[PDB]
Design a protein around this ligand. Sequence first.
Ligand SMILES: [Zn+2]
Length: 44
Amino acid sequence: IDPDKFCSLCHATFNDPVMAQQHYVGKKHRKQETKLKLMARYGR
RNA sequence: GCCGUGGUCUGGUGGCCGG
RNA sequence: CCGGCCACCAGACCACGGC
Ligand SMILES: [Zn+2]
């Protein structure tokens, strides 16, 4: 089953089931949110 | 010079789907 | 066994900031 998904934190779109889950628990996403969150939080 | 994120590329493993 | 897909790990390259 292929459920469309989107990684707002990385601007990446998903098509495959494992394609999404694998990325959500990945390195290039967890640390990505860190820099993104910092930018948004510091942008005030 | 190193450190942290990001992106592509290079190699190893696994899963999703079909034949 | 083969093909479309993602992650994890390390290397090369570059942008930013810290020391
Ligand atoms: Zn992500």
